[PDB]
Design a protein around this motif. Structure first.
Motif, PDB file in Angstrom:
ATOM      1  N   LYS A  22      16.130  -7.162  -6.439  1.00 10.94           N
ATOM      2  CA  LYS A  22      16.295  -8.596  -6.278  1.00 10.94           C
ATOM      3  C   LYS A  22      15.154  -9.126  -5.429  1.00 10.94           C
ATOM      4  CE  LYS A  22      19.908  -8.724  -8.752  1.00 10.94           C
ATOM      5  NZ  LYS A  22      21.282  -8.695  -8.183  1.00 10.94           N
ATOM      6  N   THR A  23      14.811 -10.393  -5.610  1.00  7.66           N
ATOM      7  CA  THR A  23      13.708 -10.989  -4.876  1.00  7.66           C
ATOM      8  C   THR A  23      13.988 -10.984  -3.368  1.00  7.66           C
ATOM      9  OG1 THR A  23      13.219 -12.479  -6.739  1.00  7.66           O
ATOM     10  CG2 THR A  23      12.253 -13.033  -4.599  1.00  7.66           C
ATOM     11  N   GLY A  24      13.196 -10.239  -2.602  1.00  7.30           N
ATOM     12  CA  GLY A  24      13.350 -10.273  -1.159  1.00  7.30           C
ATOM     13  C   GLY A  24      13.196  -8.923  -0.480  1.00  7.30           C
ATOM     14  N   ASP A  25      13.585  -7.845  -1.151  1.00 10.24           N
ATOM     15  CA  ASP A  25      13.564  -6.527  -0.516  1.00 10.24           C
ATOM     16  C   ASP A  25      12.259  -5.796  -0.814  1.00 10.24           C
ATOM     17  OD1 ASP A  25      14.800  -3.899   0.610  1.00 10.24           O
ATOM     18  OD2 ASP A  25      16.381  -5.415   0.762  1.00 10.24           O
ATOM     19  N   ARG A  26      12.171  -4.525  -0.433  1.00  5.03           N
ATOM     20  CA  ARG A  26      10.910  -3.801  -0.520  1.00  5.03           C
ATOM     21  C   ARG A  26      10.958  -2.695  -1.570  1.00  5.03           C
ATOM     22  NH1 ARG A  26       8.919  -1.223   4.959  1.00  5.03           N
ATOM     23  NH2 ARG A  26      10.816   0.035   4.635  1.00  5.03           N
ATOM     24  N   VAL A  27      10.001  -2.729  -2.485  1.00  2.49           N
ATOM     25  CA  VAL A  27       9.874  -1.694  -3.499  1.00  2.49           C
ATOM     26  C   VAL A  27       8.501  -1.041  -3.404  1.00  2.49           C
ATOM     27  CG1 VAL A  27       9.936  -1.154  -5.970  1.00  2.49           C
ATOM     28  CG2 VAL A  27      11.439  -2.929  -5.054  1.00  2.49           C
ATOM     29  N   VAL A  28       8.489   0.261  -3.161  1.00  2.00           N
ATOM     30  CA  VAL A  28       7.251   1.016  -3.106  1.00  2.00           C
ATOM     31  C   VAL A  28       6.901   1.531  -4.493  1.00  2.00           C
ATOM     32  CG1 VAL A  28       6.019   2.952  -2.055  1.00  2.00           C
ATOM     33  CG2 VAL A  28       7.756   1.720  -0.741  1.00  2.00           C
ATOM     34  N   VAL A  29       5.834   0.997  -5.059  1.00  2.02           N
ATOM     35  CA  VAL A  29       5.428   1.364  -6.401  1.00  2.02           C
ATOM     36  C   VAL A  29       4.371   2.455  -6.359  1.00  2.02           C
ATOM     37  CG1 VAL A  29       4.556   0.532  -8.616  1.00  2.02           C
ATOM     38  CG2 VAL A  29       5.861  -1.004  -7.126  1.00  2.02           C
ATOM     39  N   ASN A  30       4.753   3.652  -6.757  1.00  2.37           N
ATOM     40  CA  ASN A  30       3.831   4.772  -6.789  1.00  2.37           C
ATOM     41  C   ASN A  30       3.538   5.143  -8.236  1.00  2.37           C
ATOM     42  OD1 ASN A  30       2.665   7.418  -6.777  1.00  2.37           O
ATOM     43  ND2 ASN A  30       3.489   7.795  -4.733  1.00  2.37           N
ATOM     44  N   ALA A  31       2.406   4.677  -8.742  1.00  6.45           N
ATOM     45  CA  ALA A  31       2.034   4.907 -10.132  1.00  6.45           C
ATOM     46  C   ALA A  31       1.277   6.218 -10.284  1.00  6.45           C
ATOM     47  CB  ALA A  31       1.207   3.749 -10.658  1.00  6.45           C
ATOM     48  N   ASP A  32       0.915   6.818  -9.155  1.00  3.25           N
ATOM     49  CA  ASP A  32       0.295   8.138  -9.159  1.00  3.25           C
ATOM     50  C   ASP A  32       1.289   9.147  -9.711  1.00  3.25           C
ATOM     51  OD1 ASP A  32      -2.236   7.559  -7.344  1.00  3.25           O
ATOM     52  OD2 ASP A  32      -0.537   6.820  -6.176  1.00  3.25           O
ATOM     53  N   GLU A  33       2.510   9.065  -9.202  1.00  2.00           N
ATOM     54  CA  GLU A  33       3.586   9.946  -9.616  1.00  2.00           C
ATOM     55  C   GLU A  33       4.401   9.312 -10.742  1.00  2.00           C
ATOM     56  OE1 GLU A  33       2.148  12.408  -7.922  1.00  2.00           O
ATOM     57  OE2 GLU A  33       4.036  13.168  -7.114  1.00  2.00           O
ATOM     58  N   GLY A  34       4.485   7.986 -10.732  1.00  2.00           N
ATOM     59  CA  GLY A  34       5.316   7.286 -11.694  1.00  2.00           C
ATOM     60  C   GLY A  34       6.707   7.060 -11.144  1.00  2.00           C
ATOM     61  N   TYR A  35       6.778   6.360 -10.023  1.00  2.50           N
ATOM     62  CA  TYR A  35       8.010   6.250  -9.266  1.00  2.50           C
ATOM     63  C   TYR A  35       8.118   4.881  -8.614  1.00  2.50           C
ATOM     64  CZ  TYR A  35      11.390  10.011  -8.447  1.00  2.50           C
ATOM     65  OH  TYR A  35      12.468  10.865  -8.528  1.00  2.50           O
ATOM     66  N   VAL A  36       9.327   4.355  -8.559  1.00  2.00           N
ATOM     67  CA  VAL A  36       9.586   3.105  -7.865  1.00  2.00           C
ATOM     68  C   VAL A  36      10.643   3.317  -6.788  1.00  2.00           C
ATOM     69  CG1 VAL A  36       8.817   1.474  -9.625  1.00  2.00           C
ATOM     70  CG2 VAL A  36      11.110   2.450  -9.780  1.00  2.00           C
ATOM     71  N   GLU A  37      10.203   3.324  -5.542  1.00  2.00           N
ATOM     72  CA  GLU A  37      11.080   3.623  -4.426  1.00  2.00           C
ATOM     73  C   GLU A  37      11.601   2.341  -3.795  1.00  2.00           C
ATOM     74  OE1 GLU A  37       7.893   6.048  -2.410  1.00  2.00           O
ATOM     75  OE2 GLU A  37       9.399   7.626  -2.566  1.00  2.00           O
ATOM     76  N   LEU A  38      12.880   2.064  -3.999  1.00  2.00           N
ATOM     77  CA  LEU A  38      13.511   0.909  -3.384  1.00  2.00           C
ATOM     78  C   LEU A  38      13.894   1.242  -1.952  1.00  2.00           C
ATOM     79  CD1 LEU A  38      14.695  -1.974  -3.645  1.00  2.00           C
ATOM     80  CD2 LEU A  38      16.849  -0.891  -4.297  1.00  2.00           C
ATOM     81  N   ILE A  39      13.198   0.638  -1.004  1.00  2.00           N
ATOM     82  CA  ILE A  39      13.426   0.928   0.397  1.00  2.00           C
ATOM     83  C   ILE A  39      14.011  -0.289   1.069  1.00  2.00           C
ATOM     84  CG2 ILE A  39      12.481   1.878   2.520  1.00  2.00           C
ATOM     85  CD1 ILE A  39      12.096   3.696   0.145  1.00  2.00           C
ATOM     86  N   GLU A  40      15.235  -0.133   1.515  1.00  2.00           N
ATOM     87  CA  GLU A  40      16.030  -1.241   2.007  1.00  2.00           C
ATOM     88  C   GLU A  40      15.496  -1.751   3.334  1.00  2.00           C
ATOM     89  OE1 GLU A  40      20.411   0.073   1.020  1.00  2.00           O
ATOM     90  OE2 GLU A  40      19.008   1.743   0.828  1.00  2.00           O
TER      91      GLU A  40
END
Length: 132
Positions: free
Chosen positions: A114-132
């Motif tokens: 959702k608009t507002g929180d933090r998502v770490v986009v790692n395209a090296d590995e192919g991963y989207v880390e939702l970090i609250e």
């Protein structure tokens, strides 16, 4: 939660997650120099400069491979873009502008993001880390 997606480009980006909901493509929508979303959806009027953009898909997608680079060299482009169904023209633009592009196969990502929180986009590995 950290999902594994199908990566086209590489690199890793950290920013605030912005979800525009609607099927908007890079036919336009964003001001080429100002980086302001001039297209209407809900969060119209803000800038995508240095944050994470999430889209389900984009209607048309006939153009956009050039605008991604222009926005990036202005610094008003999104750091990374996550799609459920992306386009090759987007991949090309993202590759030149260094914009980690990953395609997610599961809908749960869009339910969680959702608009507002933090998502770490790692395209090296192919991963989207939702970090609250």
């Amino acid at each position: 939660v950290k999902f594994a997606c199908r990566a086209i480009t590489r690199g890793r980006a950290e920013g605030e997650a912005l979800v525009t909901k609607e099927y908007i493509s890079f036919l336009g929508g964003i001001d080429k120099e100002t980086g302001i979303v001039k297209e209407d959806c809900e969060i119209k009027g803000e800038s995508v400069a240095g944050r994470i953009l999430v889209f389900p898909g984009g209607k048309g997608s006939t153009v956009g491979s050039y605008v991604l680079l222009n926005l990036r060299k202005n610094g008003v482009a999104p750091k990374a873009i996550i799609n459920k169904k992306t386009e090759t023209i987007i991949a090309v633009g993202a590759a030149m502008a260094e914009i980690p592009l990953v395609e997610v196969r599961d809908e749960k990502f869009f339910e969680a993001v959702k608009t507002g929180d933090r998502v770490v986009v790692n395209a090296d590995e192919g991963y989207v880390e939702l970090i609250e």
